[PDB]
Design a protein around this ligand. Structure first.
Ligand SMILES: Cc1cc2[nH]c(-c3n[nH]c4c3C[C@@H]3C[C@]3(C)C4)nc2cc1N(C)C(=O)[C@H](C)N1CCOCC1
Length: 264
């Protein structure tokens, strides 16, 4: 089943917090360690999420964070996930800055690409792919998390392309203009995630307002090459940022290209 009773969970340590609610490390009965995300009232369209949870849980891949179930008996609801020991990739990059080999950084991009090629084949669009939405686990494996979750967020300032909080830094032009999501808009976001990885967690378009990012991208500006990215890796990042979605590589193509670079 996909419904987890409240008696099947324990809450050991709070590990995260934000406007969504809280995250705890806990245990799940007869099924080991978990991260439990408690959702604040009004943050999410809970009925829409609960309607799709069972189908969402069948998206299972070694490079995707597994959703194990939903505790919905009483408010607030909890979502129960696979526990990732090193936390979000954005913070992991920042705290370990200066300690990465370029091969490790490319390997993190490959893990994300592998999870995204699975979602692309399943015709599942992430919509908000970024280093903050990737988690680091056993042996520094990266896994993609929160795919499709912006479909349930109730904060219009974050979900509307004209919203004050919209994540325009990772959005392709057709997303920041029209909310035209596709696997090719996720590819643009993946180019920005690659830039976050090779820069060791710098924030893209630092200090630029949302309208300034739109004006810059529309006028051909692109993120500068990080020092640790080779010319060839930066070439692939620029292919992710092609203005037309049709000219961007699919994740299946990126996965072969990046693997050839890593394995050579
Ligand atoms: C800060 C933090 C947040 C973490 N968030 C998650 C996490 N795992 N899975 C999900 C999520 C987050 C989100 C619920 C998901 C969709 C899925 N892992 C996390 C690990 C840490 N790190 C680096 C720690 O040092 C914490 C304090 N430690 C780790 C060792 O064990 C003891 C506690």
């Amino acid at each position: 089943k996909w419904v987890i009773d409240p008696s099947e969970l324990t809450f050991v340590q709070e590990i995260g917090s934000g406007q969504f609610g809280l995250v705890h490390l806990g245990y799940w009965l007869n099924k080991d360690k978990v991260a439990i995300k408690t959702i604040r009232e009004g943050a999410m369209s809970e009925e829409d999420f609960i309607e799709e949870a069972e189908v969402m849980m069948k998206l299972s891949h070694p490079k995707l964070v597994q959703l194990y179930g939903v505790c919905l008996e009483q408010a607030p609801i909890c979502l129960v996930f696979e526990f990732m020991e090193h936390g979000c990739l954005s913070d992991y990059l920042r705290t370990q800055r200066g300690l990465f080999a370029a091969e490790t950084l490319l390997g993190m991009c490959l893990d994300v690409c592998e999870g995204m090629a699975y979602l692309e084949e399943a015709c599942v669009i992430h919509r908000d792919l970024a280093a903050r939405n990737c988690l680091v686990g056993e042996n520094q494996v990266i896994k993609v998390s929160d795919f499709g979750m912006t479909r349930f967020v109730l904060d219009d300032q974050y979900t509307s392309s004209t919203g004050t909080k919209f994540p325009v830094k990772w959005a392709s032009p057709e997303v920041f203009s029209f909310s035209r999501y596709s696997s090719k808009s996720d590819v643009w976001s993946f180019g920005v995630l690659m830039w976050e990885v090779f820069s060791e967690g710098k924030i893209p378009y630092e200090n630029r307002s949302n309208s300034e990012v739109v004006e810059d991208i529309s006028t051909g500006f692109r993120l500068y090459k990080p020092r640790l990215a080779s010319t060839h890796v930066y070439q692939i990042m620029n292919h992710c940022w092609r203005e037309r979605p049709e000219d961007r590589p699919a994740f299946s193509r990126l996965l072969r290209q990046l693997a050839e670079i890593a394995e050579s």
